[PDB]
Structures are given as structure tokens and as C-alpha cells.
Amino acid sequence: GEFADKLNEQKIAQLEEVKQASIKQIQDAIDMEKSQQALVQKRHYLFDVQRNNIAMALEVTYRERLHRVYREVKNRLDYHISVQNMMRQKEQEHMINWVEKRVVQ
Template structure:
């Protein structure tokens, strides 16, 4: 039936090349999706439950709705009897050796399994503790880096105020320098004006002294000895 279906559908698929291309493209798009962005499921801390040491519990729960409680055991027994009756598996000395080795393994697991499991759990706990320590250290460093970044952002925000204060200081220095220069120019002009005033006063004083000297000399020259005697006579008495 399946071979007939394949023979009948082969010409249709051959003529419908676009459908085949679409199917191939769809399959490629499904297989080339970004799996790296999918969330990783967490690893179980403990293994699943088993029966008889090796048979998973999920197998029994899967067969219970179809076969009931005894279904898995009947399936296992029937499969074993089928293998033995059809001589698919022949019991020989290797079977006895395998049973002996299995018994030794089971005994070793029962005897040393708890101590080995405890040792493995201890190693696992140490690894988890080291990983947690590294994680906590990384989180602390990242938190400190975030705080430093926030502080730097706060400093950047306050930098504008600092620049404004520096601009005001520069403006005040320029204004102070300008006023000092005006004061210096005013003092220099005042000194020159004072010099001119003193120079004029000196000229006036020298002219007055010269005039006084000239008048005195002329007055003295104009006095004759006859005019000086009457004036000197009262002084001698």
C-alpha cells in the first residue's frame, strides 16, 4: 500500500517542483533557527526514579493506561520468553559470567554506593560553593562598577555647574583686571595733571619771587644816602 502511494505521488511531486522547493525551504528554515537564544533547561539535582535498579519509572507509568499494573512485567516476561523460545538469545557460559558480574556490580553498588554518592555530593557541593563564591564576587564587582558609573554620571551632571562657576570666575578676573587698568590710567593722568599744576605753581612762585626781588632792588637803588640818614638816626638812639 505504501509502495503504491509512493509510485502514485512521485509524478505529482516531480511536476510540482515549487511545492518540493517550498517544503525544502521550510524544513531548512526550521532547522536553521537560532537555537542559541532558547532558554537552557536547568539540570536536575537528582536522578529519576527506577525499579529493580535499571528500569525507569516512566516506562511503567507509560504502560499503566494501556496494560494495567501487571502490564510492564508481562511485557518483560513475554519478551524474555520470546527471545529464549526463538533462540534469539542462547543461554551459555557467557550468560552465567554476565549474571555473576552483574551480581558483583549490584553488591558493590549496594555496599559502596551510599559512601561514593556522599563523596560525590561533597565534591559537587564544593564546586557549587566555589561557583557561588565566584558569582558573588562578580556580582559585587558589577555592583561596585554600577555605583562608580552612577557617581561618574553625577559628576558629569555637575560639570556644567563647575564650568559656569569657572566662566564667572574668569569674567570676574577680566573685570578686575579692566578696573585695575582704568585705576592705573586714572592715577597716571592725575600724576601728570598734578605735575602740570605744580609746574605752573612753580612758575608763578618764581615769577612772584623775581618780581619781589626786582621791586626790592629797585626800591633800594632808588633810596639815596640823604634819604637813608633820617631813617637810620632814630635807630641809633
């Protein structure tokens, strides 16, 4: 009678480890595949971030250069005006003093 029970419980136990292995292995075929899919697309992005960064940094630089030329020229131009303006004021200032000193005479 027991002949069966031990054997049977043995036989089940087996297919119980069999189903188990089987899940565990196919879960692993699964992981492997995710690992791959990732290394695929995935990895390039790192270098893409890097290349993008460069591209931008040159653009900013180009633009900044342009802005610098502007600022500096305009700056040279504005100097002449500021000067001119200062001269006038000083000349003017002087004239009023010349006037009062003379009219209050």
C-alpha cells in the same frame, strides 16, 4: 562518598563566584553612577570659571578706565599749580637777589 564532596565543593565554589560577581557588578553600577553625577554638576564649573573670569576682567577694565580719566585730568590740573608754584619761586628768588645787590650797595 566523594560524589558529594566534589559536587558540594563545586556547588560552593559556584556561589562563591556568584557572590563575587555580584559584589563586583554592583560596585560597578556604583562607579558608573559616580561617573555620571560628576559629569552632571561637575563639568559646568569649568565654563563658569571662564565666564566669571570674563565678567571680572571687564569690571577691572571699566574701573581702570575711570581711574585713568581721573589721573589724567587731575594730572593736567596739577600741572598748572606746579607751574604757578615754579614761577613764584623763581620770581621770589629773583627779588631777594635784587634786594641784597641793592642794600649791600
